[PDB]
């Protein structure tokens, strides 16, 4: 996260760490949607261009973390993935369209002060909060500079108009994405960065006070550059894919 802050203890109880067994290392961010399911960017799994193609056995999921690096002894819980599900129409070939994936943990995780799921948005929550101008919050243990933080970082970013979004890049922007960041005039910064991927873009609902997961950190050009924005998977646009797998693979 670029130009963010040290998260407070239990500020983001849904943040997960996608951690590689060997070498032991932080792959990406993710989020707990229930005691058995994790949500991430498919590109954290699969990415042929870089010879990336992790299996269930190549990873570890770590929930309850604050500290980037230390093993937080009675606070964190490590899990073994049971299954991996990548959107069947994820586009690694052109724009990272549909960069979503689900993870079935091998045994449910017990909730605690530091571990608690985030709510998936319904058609109306989506419709009333997803408005340019509205701020959302991103989290992660990714680079601080377009370096590796000590503690979980947080940043609040305003949502940007589709058009401003399209004109800041040459990449083809689909309806499954949304961009965020401040405008250069706004003179306020912050962004996600390498290693931030898969983390949640969340919003607090003013109707019922619940945290909602609207986006998934997906991609961007550089990190915190004027005239450039962060791009996120639109969690609501793909809710039917999500609904559809939780009840076949059955969460």
């Amino acid at each position: 996260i670029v130009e963010g802050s040290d998260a407070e203890i239990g500020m983001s109880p849904w943040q997960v760490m996608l951690f590689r067994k060997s070498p032991q290392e932080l792959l990406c961010g993710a989020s707990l949607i229930s005691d058995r399911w994790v949500l991430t960017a498919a590109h954290c799994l699969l990415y042929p261009p870089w010879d990336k193609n992790f299996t269930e056995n190549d990873l570890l999921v770590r929930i309850g973390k604050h500290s980037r690096t230390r093993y937080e002894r009675n606070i964190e819980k490590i899990s073994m993935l049971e299954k991996i599900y990548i959107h069947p129409r994820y586009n690694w070939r052109e724009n990272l369209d549909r960069d979503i994936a689900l993870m079935k943990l091998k045994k449910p995780v017990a909730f605690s002060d530091y571990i608690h799921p985030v709510c998936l948005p319904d058609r109306e929550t989506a419709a009333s909060l997803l408005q340019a101008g509205y701020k959302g919050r991103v989290t992660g243990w990714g680079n601080l500079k377009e370096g590796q933080p000590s503690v979980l970082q947080v940043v609040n970013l305003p949502i940007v108009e589709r058009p401003v979004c399209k004109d800041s890049t040459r990449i083809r922007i689909t309806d499954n994405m949304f961009c965020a960041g401040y405008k250069p005039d706004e003179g306020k910064r912050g962004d996600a960065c390498e290693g931030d991927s898969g983390g949640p873009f969340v919003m607090k609902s003013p109707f019922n006070n619940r945290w909602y997961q609207m986006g998934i950190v997906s991609w961007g050009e550089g990190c915190d550059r004027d005239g450039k924005y962060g791009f996120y998977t639109h969690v609501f646009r793909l809710k039917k894919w999500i609904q559809k797998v939780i009840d076949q693979f059955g969460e």
Binding site: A41, E194, W219
Partner: peptide
Amino acid sequence: XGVR
């Protein structure tokens, strides 16, 4: 773009 940089796939994050």
